[PDB]
């Protein structure tokens, strides 16, 4: 399948509390493999996956010094946007960046990303053609003209097509088999009281990786989308994930409902029913 | 390897 290398960047000013916090977090196929935090006692790039430790001391020193120069660039950027938006030097503000590439099975670039955000709202983004910019407001228009004059879109097309893909394949050689690891969900149904003649049937999916999963409740063969309750997928804390879905059913009609678990680790979708003890 | 960012 396709692969991706993406970097999530955060720069937060905190006037009166110290220097801005800067973070660089890298993901291979949505999996964190490197992270830089300026608030550490020693600010250095650190591997977040054991398979990144084969990379030599020159790689870590090159990335660390690059992050530190990026941090200075963001410190300047936070001051610039105070002028763009006519904001005071006393407030805290956030700059966020998503940067990276999506690569297909043939090794060719599928999608390139360079997206910015200021205080949680879109600021500017590189368009899918990798030649034009989409600016979200008047302040972003200043950045757009500045970047158009300097050919910045030109500079990222070269990085996204060349540098990003080459690093992604280099990282993939060390961690390709690790990223494909899956853990299938273990599932069961629980039974809970409801007022009067109703009961709740809760279908659990536990200990699965990756996080993508689908849980459905069926009366006969009809999916009960409008009537069920479900929680957002959540981490167990040990690397796996959890999710549940529940429906309120009439008392005595529990055996009329079926739960279905769809996960990429399963040979075929799981089918479950409420099962009372002997 | 993350890109070197350009000023806004």
């Amino acid at each position: 399948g396709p692969h991706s290398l993406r970097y999530f960047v955060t720069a937060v000013s905190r006037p009166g509390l110290g220097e801005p916090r800067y973070m660089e977090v890298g993901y291979v196929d949505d999996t964190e493999f490197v992270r830089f935090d300026s608030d550490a006692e020693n600010p250095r790039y650190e591997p977040r996956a054991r398979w990144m430790e084969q990379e030599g001391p020159e790689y870590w020193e090159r990335e660390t010094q690059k992050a530190k120069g990026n941090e200075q660039s963001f410190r300047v950027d936070l001051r610039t946007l105070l002028g763009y938006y006519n904001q005071s030097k006393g407030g805290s503000h956030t700059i966020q960046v998503i940067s990276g590439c999506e690569v297909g099975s043939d090794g060719r670039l599928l999608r390139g990303y360079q997206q910015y955000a200021y205080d949680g709202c879109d600021y500017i983004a590189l368009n899918e053609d990798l030649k034009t910019w989409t600016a979200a407001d008047m302040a972003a228009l200043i950045t757009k003209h500045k970047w158009e004059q300097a050919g910045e879109a030109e500079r990222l097309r070269a990085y996204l097509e060349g540098t990003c893909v080459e690093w992604l394949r280099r990282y993939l050689k060390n961690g390709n088999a690790t990223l494909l690891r899956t853990d299938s969900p273990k599932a069961h149904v629980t039974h809970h009281s409801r007022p009067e003649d109703k009961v709740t049937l809760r279908c659990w999916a536990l200990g699965f990786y990756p996080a993508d999963i689908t849980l459905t409740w069926q009366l006969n063969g009809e999916e009960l989308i409008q009537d069920m309750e479900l929680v957002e997928t959540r981490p167990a804390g040990d690397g796996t994930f959890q999710k549940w879905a529940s429906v309120v059913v009439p008392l005595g009609k529990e055996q009329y409902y079926t739960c279905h678990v769809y996960h990429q680790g399963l040979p075929e979708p799981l089918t479950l029913r409420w099962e009372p003890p002997p | 390897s993350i890109i070197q960012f350009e000023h806004l």
Partner: protein
């Protein structure tokens, strides 16, 4: 500003008398500054470990707080979050069926 969404749940299926992990999963909040406490019978738990903060594709941040605990039949647990989006700290109570 975006209001945090909170889930309080155990890592393993809860069994009274068996050591476990209680999680407080806080998502969809902006700005990233946040304060998260875990309470036992209304009283702050002193050792609460925090995961590194990450952010999503809609730009909102998320983080996992957890603490070792041994559930009992009558002990009540909760997670309290202070964030600029809300006038008030928000408290979410652990429901062992959820």
């Amino acid at each position: 500003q975006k209001t945090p969404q909170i889930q309080v749940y155990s890592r393993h299926p809860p069994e009274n008398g068996k050591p476990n992990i209680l999680n407080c999963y806080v998502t969809q909040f902006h700005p990233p500054h946040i304060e998260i406490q875990m309470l036992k019978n209304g009283k702050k738990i002193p050792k609460v470990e925090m995961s590194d903060m990450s952010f999503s594709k809609d730009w909102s941040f998320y983080i996992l707080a957890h603490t070792e605990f041994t559930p009992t039949e009558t002990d009540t647990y909760a997670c309290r979050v202070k964030h600029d989006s809300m006038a008030e700290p928000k408290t979410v109570y652990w429901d062992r069926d959820m």
